[PDB]
Amino acid sequence: MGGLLFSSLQHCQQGFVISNELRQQQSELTSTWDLMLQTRINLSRSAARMMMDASNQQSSAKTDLLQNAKTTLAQAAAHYANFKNMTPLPAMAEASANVDEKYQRYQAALAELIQFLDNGNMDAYFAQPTQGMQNALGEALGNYARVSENLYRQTFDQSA
Numbered sequence: 265m266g267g268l269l270f271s272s273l274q275h276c277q278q279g280f281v282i283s284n285e286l287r288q289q290q291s292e293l294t295s296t297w298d299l300m301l302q303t304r305i306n307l308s309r310s311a312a313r314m315m316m317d318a319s320n321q322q323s324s325a326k327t328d329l330l331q332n333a334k335t336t337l338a339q340a341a342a343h344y345a346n347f348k349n350m351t352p353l354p355a356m357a358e359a360s361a362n363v364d365e366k367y368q369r370y371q372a373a374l375a376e377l378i379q380f381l382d383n384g385n386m387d388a389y390f391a392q393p394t395q396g397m398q399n400a401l402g403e404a405l406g407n408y409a410r411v412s413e414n415l416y417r418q419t420f421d422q423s424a
């Protein structure tokens with residue numbers, strides 16, 4: 265914004281300390297959603313290959329699309345672990361708990377789907393209610409985003 269933003273160095277610096285945590289927290293969450301979606305996509309392209317069958321050598325249990333799924337899923341929980349390590353801010357603590365809930369469920373879901381397809385079991389792949397659990401975490405993360413956005417807005421002058 266521009267002009268008259270902060271009452272003093274104490275007020276500017278206070279707003280920096282909150283915004284710099286917020287930022288780091290949000291970086292971790294953003295990278296965790298992003299690698300869970302790449303994992304879902306990489307399960308999808310595996311399964312579609314599976315379903316074209318006749319196939320070509322090894323495709324299902326082993327070979328490398330599923331290995332890719334295993335890698336991006338194992339990078340998303342690492343970012344979540346960095347998130348979980350961080351100081352819960354008072355203003356963010358409900359949002360953050362609601363996030364862990366749906367995160368836990370969508371991680372587990374994703375991990376399971378990897379084992380279904382590694383077992384070649386396409387009916388279980390499709391039987392799992394994956395999208396409801398993906399969306400729930402989407403809504404929890406958009407709920408965190410909003411609450412971070414309000415906390416962030418209170419750090420500088422309310423008048424533009």
Ligand SMILES: c1cnc2c(c1)ccc1cccnc12
Pocket residue numbers: 276277278279280283284419420
């Ligand atoms: C570098 C990065 N962000 C900031 C500052 C400096 C200083 C103040 C501040 C206040 C609110 C939010 N972010 C910042």
